[PDB]
Design a protein around this ligand. Structure first.
Ligand SMILES: CCCCCCCCCCCCCCCCCC(=O)OC[C@H](COP(=O)(O)OCCN)OC(=O)CCCCCCCCCCCCCCCCC
Ligand SMILES: CCCCCCCCCCCCCCCCCC(=O)OC[C@H](COP(=O)(O)OCCN)OC(=O)CCCCCCCCCCCCCCCCC
Ligand SMILES: NC(=O)C1=CN([C@@H]2O[C@H](COP(=O)(O)OP(=O)(O)OC[C@H]3O[C@@H](n4cnc5c(N)ncnc54)[C@H](OP(=O)(O)O)[C@@H]3O)[C@@H](O)[C@H]2O)C=CC1
Ligand SMILES: CCCCCCCCCCCC(=O)OC[C@H](COP(=O)(O)OCC[N+](C)(C)C)OC(=O)CCCCCCCCCCC
Ligand SMILES: CCCCCCCCCCCC(=O)OC[C@H](COP(=O)(O)OCC[N+](C)(C)C)OC(=O)CCCCCCCCCCC
Ligand SMILES: CCCCCCCCCCCC(=O)OC[C@H](COP(=O)(O)OCC[N+](C)(C)C)OC(=O)CCCCCCCCCCC
Ligand SMILES: CCCCCCCCCCCC(=O)OC[C@H](COP(=O)(O)OCC[N+](C)(C)C)OC(=O)CCCCCCCCCCC
Ligand SMILES: CCCCCCCCCCCC(=O)OC[C@H](COP(=O)(O)OCC[N+](C)(C)C)OC(=O)CCCCCCCCCCC
Ligand SMILES: CCCCCCCCCCCC(=O)OC[C@H](COP(=O)(O)OCC[N+](C)(C)C)OC(=O)CCCCCCCCCCC
Ligand SMILES: CCCCCCCCCCCC(=O)OC[C@H](COP(=O)(O)OCC[N+](C)(C)C)OC(=O)CCCCCCCCCCC
Ligand code: SF4
Lengths: 71, 353, 451, 161, 175, 368
């Protein structure tokens, strides 16, 4: 059983995943070509969490009871 | 040139084979999204996509390209790790699982006596990709999906693994290609019709497809773990989920419907008798037929994936937990005892040949 | 209640009741000396701790942390419009639900007081914006009762015929969206084509697909166009099959029954005390219907039955709404056969506008046409409380008249407003996906709630 | 160029700087993956897949436990460390990577001579099953006995009633 | 520092294609414009009776999915915001936050008299007199409610506007 | 802003027109003025358009980016904000923007040169063409915004072209042209603060040594509102700057503590918050990206400006001549760097930096 063909496929799969991100990063127009609202790191109204419109308490690190923990 | 080109192609030939293999899977996955919308439309007495490319043949391209031209939303540009680690792990898990899927006799990238174990092990890694999105996230809907995702895994993983082991036990082999060839005289749908239903139910649960679509319930958790995803992270997760649908549909054709084996042996011989085995045209047609047999069986279950979505309401995940442990697990464990008893009784314990 | 030294808004010190004898321990000593000789240094020694954490009265200051607070806000498909449903979740189980409304509050009742009775009618089309013509009917009946006028026979049948066509339209929106929220997408698409056929009947008689200001105080705006009854009947012969095919996917489905049976149970005692009406009231075993308790607009001249549940859960209410589908189709058939000739509005030109042809030839008709559209018609002073069996339940209007042409007060009673007020009492203890089913089973339209 | 060295160096760097519990379970995944891949090549493909089949399921159960316990402690607790001292610590650990001090055993290569006497060739898993169910069947039955104890043990510890 | 600006260079919307790079970036724009026009994903933002007509666009009679139109529940996955209903003062901050959470490119459609200018509730104490007071509107759809064909016509107008975008040729010629 | 910007309800323009304001000064009110804001889709432009249109003044916004102009219309009522597709190389488009305008505000300027425009074309050529077109249209008032270190004899291309731009505008439009020299402006998404907030700031030892007098952007837009509606400001030069001098290194370190990047001691160095590079390497990298990168990067001229500090022309006028008190950066620093805070998220307690807290943090930064 020879697995050189398999190794090449695994290498391509890893490279293929980065292509999707690289293409999306190099295809989107720059913010200045858009409405020019600046970088996403400053647009806090956009990078904030989604809560269906109304902001609520921030409970990111609160405990979450689990009713199926025994299962 | 000429001489230096006629060996350069030989040097790079097997990379073209893999690239063609990757394109073959992507085309099916790309047009499964179009097929699902078309199939549900007519069942719902609508049309489905027919205005993006001639009769809707470019619908998949437009959806992918538009999302690839979308802004990536993240707290900072350096946070590309957080929203990409999840989808990439999920995508790599399902793409690597396709290595052991033989389109014909020996026509798989990875051949091994442990192909069954590699298949199940690779799929389990994809679950870790989904839970990564809920990484102490500030989004409450993302968090709730991660809890549901873990609950679903506990449901199907035991049931799905044991059903595959029964088929492997019947053939006494963990090689997928050996399992396919063992169904020459009988397709395992007939002796193990209950297992095929159980396998399909577990396949629906594994892919988080309805009626087990609790992870991405639009009426419950807006978009689940993908509510905070956009542009490429959404595409990769969307691609991985549909790649699992094709993979599980192909697996159902392999385990219970003979894989690539012809529907009729007589028809297979007649078509191939029209071609000379001393020419490459015979093996081009042979690959089309054998994969065509697999495609027809796989397309039926991809149709069935869409069919159940358009015919059944969603089941609550806590009801799913009781469904697998109280019903599915006792049944599959009963069969894993029943089958060896039958084989030993009639002196038909399986061996590998 | 009140800030105490053991319980405040930020922390608490809980001490359970002791379940063991209060043992007395005195003279603590070691092999080298007494406790008081080494108690100064004993804080470094865990073996010298005199308080056991297993003791029920062990002091522990625990910070008060709010539960998982999930906002089922306006941007959520489950909410049928605008609703800030605040849920206190322990995992996914619901502990307390706070439905925040007013996101669709547009001051309709305030604006009505500045409009004449004719100008105020289109506001009712936009309260329960799927059952439009029933909303006009309850306000029309209230003004007609105050005006001491009676609609002619043909007018009553028209409002009965379109009253049940409206009810079919509402149940198509209510039941299928309820099934869509649970996960049944296909029945939603099948029935929304039947809405297109029925909305074409709305547009044929009024010119508006949805907001058809057709039912007015004193009759209807216009007479039926020729051929409408034939088209309505041709649809009626086929609508029976659409209902059966809908039931093929829901009624006997084991998945659908697991999502509705035992979910959102309401007792008959509590249904009355929370002002529940319609399917919510009839699901708990109480056979009450306004079309039978106080007949209006030719509902006393047609034969129909009311379905009454026994278990008071969502599945019973689904079955009732499917029976009301067939009973409404039964009424529509009778209205087509029994439609009488005659005027469609009251033969009184001081309230109902005169015909256009008569307006341009008669001096008195022109004056009445001029005054009805510029000043309106005055309504005798008084008040009324008129209720009709709306598809959502009991919809009532409390209209106060001062002898002028503009209502002095118009209180609109919304069955959905009362249904949502019981959501906390009904959905407590259920899980998150059960809340979506409970919202759907109440048939909530938030224009009606926030009128 | 042994790229396994670079992966372990990256993994070791994040082990010293990991603060919250989520980064710790990520360390566990970043540990099993090099083990599986290094097992998949070289020594044993069978146990590389067995490690993936069993430990990945344990990781998810481990992860879901973290969601029920995180209590904001490490989201604001400060750490000091220092980039220079962390690199110095990893550099010194990199200096010595000889787990054994038998230089001959580590520097001299050996071969094996294959033979054709085994006409009946089967996978290692079949031989393991042959011995485990016949020669060491007591171990298999005791393992099931231990599994039974765990099932009873989990219920009594966790269940309120 | 001598600057010699030409005086009669046409603006981008009038500028014809002269060199090879003009056709290259116009091809780049059209591929993106076709993709976004074809993959028209609105957000499920139904407020009032205008939403009912928006549902009938997805009904089998019109079947918006045949044009590539899919409604998404999250602002991240949607590029079209259809304001279908009345916008109240209690709702206005929520509408702005949801709009800001949509990644670019994004468009807003104002449907019905409520969203356009307040309509029946223009003189109400709790109603915003036009959603354009909060978010920029690309197209206004008239009607109370606009018919399912009226909304589809407005979407077609927006898609016509989108196909005329020259984002990448603007960088080549205007910047 | 206030409730009514004009000092009187009747205003007579330099060209003789009488303009009457109506309303109390809200969205539905009008001031009788029509203004053209060149470069209204930029950073300062949006502030200027918002202030003018919010009180009813008609605003004509020439534009080249179609998506960037959409958010400007929200500022004003129906018919208040108007758009004209324009290019500085199209003379007809510019003449249409100023045809109906009583005030023309030139906010067009750049620090970089591209494949289509040089620094001279935008800072000098565009300003001259706008100024000359405004005079031929009979515009009463023209407001030109130069830079803070505008000097025609400066060794920097940006400062020199800005200095020449001031002279070429006064020659074309005439002595009735008002020139504004704003300092670096701090605000939400401000270019002056965006560079400091960037984690991977290459060559921070060479670039962040510049000392400036940062001024609030909201006040600069407020000052332009004062200047446009006050004919007593015609023909004058205004230097808009804050009282407190700051060096970018002090601001960089002060921001670093506010963002709480230092919660992990190793992280700022590992994440690349310090990128010491030789200036000759920065010159080479800036020179290369001037022809490879399609987006405006740190260019050669900005490298020169890092060695030039902001010097204030004493002869020019300030906020005192306009009756305003400059805002202090310490008061507004926290609210403009707040979006970039790492976690916050009301976990334990938000650390709100007041006016006194920022000043104390400045002492800590300079404390060795
Ligand atoms: C990808 C990076 C891989 C780097 C590498 O070292 O690959 C070596 C690869 C092995 O040589 P191989 O192609 O397998 O020879 C077979 C001859 N019968 O040979 C190579 O050099 C691979 C380089 C070509 C692969 C790129 C993709 C080719 C198909 C493009 C479509
Ligand atoms: C597999 C491809 C797709 C994934 C690529 C993601 C690359 C990120 C690094 C992968 C792990 C490499 C080894 C590091 C061990 C885990 C340490 C960790 O917590 O993740 C690193 C990530 C970096 O962010 P940073 O801010 O520097 O760390 C927090 C500092 N307080 O800090 C984070 O907490 C972000 C975590 C995001 C989710 C990562 C989950 C683990 C991913 C493991 C899959 C790969 C298996 C390991 C392969 C390398 C082995 C050394
Ligand atoms: N800290 C600061 O920002 C300082 C500002 N200034 C000056 O103030 C003025 C306002 O700029 P600011 O808002 O702060 O930041 P920007 O540099 O982003 O503003 C530049 C404005 O001028 C336009 N512009 C540039 N080149 C052209 C061109 N060829 N054709 C048409 N328009 C062009 C831009 O239009 P578009 O966006 O559509 O491309 C934009 O509106 C500038 O002139 C600037 O030099 C000086 C000192 C401090
Ligand atoms: C497969 C689909 C093919 C069609 C779409 C291709 C889009 C990429 C071209 C492009 O973006 O061209 C426009 C660009 C620059 O302009 P920008 O918009 O600021 O670039 C933003 C994109 N970044 C992030 C790569 C800078 O020009 C060039 O010099 C491209 C080099
Ligand atoms: C290949 C088979 C499918 C071709 C469909 C097609 O070429 O589609 C037609 C296209 C897309 O325009 P559309 O509006 O989506 O056309 C659909 C018509 N409907 C709406 C009635 C259904 O138009 C063109 O030819 C313009 C572009 C030039 C050809 C580019 C082809 C696409 C590149 C990728 C595939 C080679
Ligand atoms: C459930 C029905 C399964 C089914 O139709 O599949 C069972 C059979 C065939 O497969 P078989 O007879 O089990 O074995 C394989 C027999 N060959 C050799 C003919 C392929 O299909 C049909 O003949 C259709
Ligand atoms: C011929 C074959 C049929 C024989 C049927 C015998 C049933 C006995 C029974 O069910 O026994 C009854 C008991 C106790 O039931 P309870 O619910 O506690 O009380 C009874 C009802 N009350 C409350 C009214 C009194 O159940 C059990 O022990 C449950 C365990 C059964 C096995 C579950 C696992 C199945 C695995 C299958 C193999 C892979
Ligand atoms: C595979 C991918 C196929 C891409 C399909 C989209 C192309 C497109 O949109 O092409 C649009 C372009 C240009 O614009 P135009 O429509 O020609 O307008 C220009 C009007 N003239 C002709 C009068 C000047 O046309 C081409 O000459 C494309 C050449 C592609 C090589
Ligand atoms: C490689 C990445 C994956 C594939 C992506 C493919 C995406 C699909 C293409 C977008 C379609 C589109 O946009 O075509 C739509 C456009 C119409 O544009 P309009 O604005 O409606 O009219 C404006 C155009 N006029 C003014 C001419 C009317 O058609 C065309 O002009 C097609 C004509 C161009 C030449 C076509 C044949 C040349 C060969 C092309 C194949 C090699
Ligand atoms: C892939 C190749 C990318 C080169 C981009 C480039 O060279 O872009 C840079 C230049 C300058 O123009 P700019 O990008 O608007 O300058 C603003 C940004 N600066 C000031 C940092 C440079 O553009 C060109 O010369 C366009 C050549 C287009 C070639 C076809 C693609
Ligand atoms: S514009 Fe008319 S149909 Fe639309 S939401 Fe307002 S009242 Fe309802």
């Amino acid at each position: 059983m020879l697995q050189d063909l398999f190794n090449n496929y695994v290498i391509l799969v890893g490279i293929l995943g980065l292509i999707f991100l690289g293409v999306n990063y190099f295809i989107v127009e720059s913010p200045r070509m858009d409405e020019n609202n600046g970088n996403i790191s400053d647009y806090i109204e956009k990078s904030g969490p989604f809560e269906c419109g109304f902001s609520s308490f921030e409970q990111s690190h609160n405990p979450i009871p689990i009713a199926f923990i025994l299962v | 040139m000429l001489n230096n080109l006629f060996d350069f192609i030989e040097y790079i030939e097997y990379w073209l084979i893999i690239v063609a293999f990757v394109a073959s899977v992507l085309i099916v996955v790309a047009y499964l999204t179009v097929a699902e919308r078309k199939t549900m439309g007519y069942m719902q007495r609508r049309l489905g996509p027919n205005a993006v490319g001639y009769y809707g043949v470019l619908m998949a391209v437009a959806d992918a390209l538009k999302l690839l031209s979308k802004e990536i939303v993240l707290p900072h540009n350096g946070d590309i790790i957080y929203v990409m680690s999840g989808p990439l792990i999920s995508l790599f898990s399902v793409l690597l699982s396709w290595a052991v899927i033989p389109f014909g006799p020996g026509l798989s990238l990875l051949d091994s006596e442990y192909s069954i174990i590699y298949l199940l092990a690779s799929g389990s890694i994809g679950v870790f990709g989904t839970v990564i999105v809920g990484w102490m996230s500030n989004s409450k809907y993302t968090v709730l999906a991660t809890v549901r995702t873990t609950a679903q895994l506990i449901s199907y993983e035991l049931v799905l693994t044991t059903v595959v082991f029964i088929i492997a036990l019947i053939v006494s082999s963990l090689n997928i290609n050996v399992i396919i060839e063992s169904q020459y005289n009988i397709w395992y749908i007939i002796p193990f019709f209950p297992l095929c239903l159980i396998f399909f139910i577990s396949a629906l649960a594994e892919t988080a497809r309805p009626p087990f679509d609790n992870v991405e319930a639009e009426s419950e958790l807006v978009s689940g773990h993908m509510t905070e995803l956009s542009a490429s992270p959404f595409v990769i997760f969307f691609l991985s989920e549909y790649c699992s649908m094709v993979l599980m549909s192909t697996l159902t054709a392999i385990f219970f419907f003979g894989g690539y084996l012809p529907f009729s042996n007589t028809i297979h011989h007649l078509i191939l008798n029209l071609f000379d085995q001393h020419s490459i045209y015979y093996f081009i047609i042979e690959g089309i037929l054998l994969s065509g047999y697999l495609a027809i069986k796989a397309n039926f279950f991809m149709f069935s994936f869409v069919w159940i979505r358009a015919a059944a309401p969603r089941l609550r995940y806590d009801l799913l937990i009781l469904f697998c442990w109280y019903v599915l697990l006792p049944i599959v464990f009963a069969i894993v005892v029943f089958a060896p008893g039958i084989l030993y009784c009639f002196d038909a314990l399986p061996v590998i040949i | 209640a009140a800030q105490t030294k053991d319980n405040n808004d930020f922390y608490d010190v809980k001490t359970k009741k002791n379940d063991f004898f209060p043992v007395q321990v005195d003279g603590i000593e070691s092999s080298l000396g007494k406790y008081e000789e080494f108690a100064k240094d004993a804080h470094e020694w865990e073996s010298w701790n005199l308080q056991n954490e297993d003791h029920p009265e062990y002091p522990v200051k625990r910070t008060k942390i709010r539960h998982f607070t999930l906002n089922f806000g306006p941007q959520h498909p489950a909410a049928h419009g605008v609703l800030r449903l605040i849920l206190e979740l322990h995992g996914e189980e619901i502990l307390r639900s706070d439905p925040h409304v007013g996101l669709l509050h547009r001051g309709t009742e305030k604006l009505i007081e500045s409009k004449t009775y004719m100008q105020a009618l289109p506001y009712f089309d936009r309260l329960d914006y799927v059952s439009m013509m029933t909303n006009e009917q309850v306000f029309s009946l209230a003004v007609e009762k105050l005006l001491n006028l009676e609609v002619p026979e043909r007018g009553q049948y028209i409002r009965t015929l379109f009253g049940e066509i409206t009810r079919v339209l509402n149940h198509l929106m209510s039941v299928l969206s309820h099934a869509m929220d649970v996960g049944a997408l296909t029945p939603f698409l099948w029935g929304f084509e039947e809405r297109e056929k029925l909305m074409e009947f709305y547009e044929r008689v009024s010119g508006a697909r949805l907001h058809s200001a057709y039912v007015r105080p004193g009759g209807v705006s216009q007479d039926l166009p020729a051929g409408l009854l034939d088209d309505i009947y041709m649809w009626a012969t086929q609508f029976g099959d659409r209902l059966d095919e809908t039931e093929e996917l829901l009624t006997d489905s084991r998945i659908w029954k697991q999502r509705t049976i035992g979910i959102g149970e309401v007792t008959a005692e509590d249904a009355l005390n929370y002002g529940l009406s319609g399917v919510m009231l009839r699901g708990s075993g109480v056979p009450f219907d306004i079309r039978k308790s106080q007949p209006y607009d030719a509902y006393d001249k047609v034969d129909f039955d009311i379905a009454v549940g026994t278990k008071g859960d969502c599945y019973d209410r689904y079955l009732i709404r499917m029976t009301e589908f067939r009973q409404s189709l039964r009424i529509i058939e009778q209205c087509c056969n029994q439609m009488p000739p005659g005027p469609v509005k009251v033969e009184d030109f001081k309230v109902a506008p005169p015909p256009r042809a008569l307006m341009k030839e008669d001096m008195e008709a022109l004056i009445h046409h001029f005054l009805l559209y510029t000043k309106g018609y005055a309504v005798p002073a008084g008040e009324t409380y008129t209720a009709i069996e709306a598809p959502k339940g009991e919809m009532a209007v409390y209209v106060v008249s001062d002898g002028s042409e503009r209502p002095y007060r118009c209180k609109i009673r919304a069955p959905g407003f009362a249904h949502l007020g019981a959501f906390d009492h009904i959905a407590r203890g259920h899980f998150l996906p059960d809340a979506v089913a409970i919202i759907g089973t109440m048939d909530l339209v938030f224009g009606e709630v926030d009128r | 160029m042994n790229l396994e060295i670079l992966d372990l160096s990256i993994l070791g760097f994040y082990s010293l700087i990991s603060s919250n519990s989520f980064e710790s379970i990520a360390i566990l995944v970043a540990t099993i993956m090099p083990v599986i891949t290094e097992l998949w090549y070289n020594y044993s493909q069978l146990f590389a897949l067995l490690y993936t089949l069993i430990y990945v399921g344990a990781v998810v159960i481990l992860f879901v436990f973290i969601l029920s316990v995180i209590n904001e402690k490490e989201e604001y607790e400060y750490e000091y460390s220092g980039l220079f001292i962390l690199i110095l610590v990893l550099l010194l650990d990199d200096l010595d990577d000889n787990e054994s001090n038998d230089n001959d055993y580590n520097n001299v290569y050996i071969t094996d001579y294959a033979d054709w006497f085994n006409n009946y060739n089967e996978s290692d898993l079949s031989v393991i099953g042959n011995l485990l169910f016949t020669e060491y069947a007591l171990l298999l039955l005791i393992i099931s006995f231990i599994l039974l104890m765990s099932i009873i043990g989990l219920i009594l510890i966790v269940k309120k009633d | 520092y001598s600057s010699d600006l030409p005086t009669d260079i046409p603006v981008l919307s009038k500028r014809p294609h002269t060199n090879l790079l003009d056709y290259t970036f116009t091809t780049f724009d059209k591929m993106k414009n076709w993709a976004r026009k074809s993959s028209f994903w609105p957000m499920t933002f139904g407020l009032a009776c205008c939403a009912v007509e928006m549902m009938h666009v997805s009904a089998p009679r019109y079947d918006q999915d045949r044009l590539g139109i899919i409604f998404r529940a999250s602002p991240r996955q949607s590029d079209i915001m259809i304001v279908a209903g009345t916008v109240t003062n209690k709702m206005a901050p929520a509408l702005r936050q949801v709009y800001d959470q949509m990644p670019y490119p994004r468009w807003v459609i104002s449907m019905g008299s409520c969203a356009n200018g307040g309509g029946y509730y223009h003189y109400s104490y709790s109603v915003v007199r036009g959603v354009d007071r909060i978010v920029p509107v690309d197209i206004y759809v008239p009607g109370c409610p606009p018919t399912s064909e009226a909304l589809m016509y407005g979407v077609f107008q927006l898609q016509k506007k989108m196909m005329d975008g020259q984002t990448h040729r603007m960088w080549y010629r205007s910047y | 802003v206030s409730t009514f910007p004009l000092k009187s309800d009747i205003n007579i323009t330099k060209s003789g027109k009488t303009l009457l304001s109506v309303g109390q000064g809200g969205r539905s009110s009008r001031t009788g003025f029509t203004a053209t804001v060149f470069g209204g889709t930029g950073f300062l432009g949006r502030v200027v358009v918002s202030k003018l249109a919010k009180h009813g003044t008609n605003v004509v916004v020439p534009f080249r980016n179609d998506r960037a102009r959409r958010q400007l219309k929200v500022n004003g009522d129906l018919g208040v904000v108007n758009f004209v597709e324009f290019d500085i190389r199209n003379l007809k488009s510019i003449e249409d923007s100023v045809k109906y305008s009583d005030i023309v505000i030139n906010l067009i300027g750049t620090e970089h040169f591209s494949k289509n425009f040089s620094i001279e074309d935008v800072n000098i050529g565009a300003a001259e063409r706008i100024a000359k077109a405004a005079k031929e249209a009979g515009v009463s008032r023209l407001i030109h915004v130069s830079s803070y270190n505008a000097n025609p004899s400066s060794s920097s291309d940006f400062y020199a072209t800005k200095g020449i731009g001031e002279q070429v505008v006064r020659d074309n439009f005439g002595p009735d042209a008002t020139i504004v020299r704003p300092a670096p402006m701090y605000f939400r998404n401000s270019p002056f603060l965006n560079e400091l907030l960037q984690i991977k700031a290459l060559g921070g030892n060479v670039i962040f040594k510049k000392e400036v007098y940062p001024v609030h952007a909201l006040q600069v837009g407020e000052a332009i509102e004062r200047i446009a509606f006050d004919d007593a400001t015609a023909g004058q030069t205004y230097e808009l700057f804050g009282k407190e001098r700051y060096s970018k290194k002090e601001l960089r370190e002060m921001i670093k503590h506010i963002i709480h990047i230092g919660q992990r001691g190793y992280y700022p160095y590992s994440a690349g918050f310090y990128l010491p590079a030789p200036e000759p390497f920065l010159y080479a990298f800036a020179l290369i990206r001037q022809y490879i990168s399609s987006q405006p990067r740190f260019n050669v001229d900005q490298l020169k400006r890092s060695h030039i500090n902001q010097e204030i022309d004493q002869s020019a006028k300030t906020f005192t001549d306009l009756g305003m008190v400059p805002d202090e950066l310490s008061e507004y620093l926290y609210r403009y760097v707040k979006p970039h805070i790492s976690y916050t998220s009301q976990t334990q307690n938000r650390t709100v930096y007041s006016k006194e807290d920022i000043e104390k943090l400045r002492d800590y930064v300079n404390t060795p």
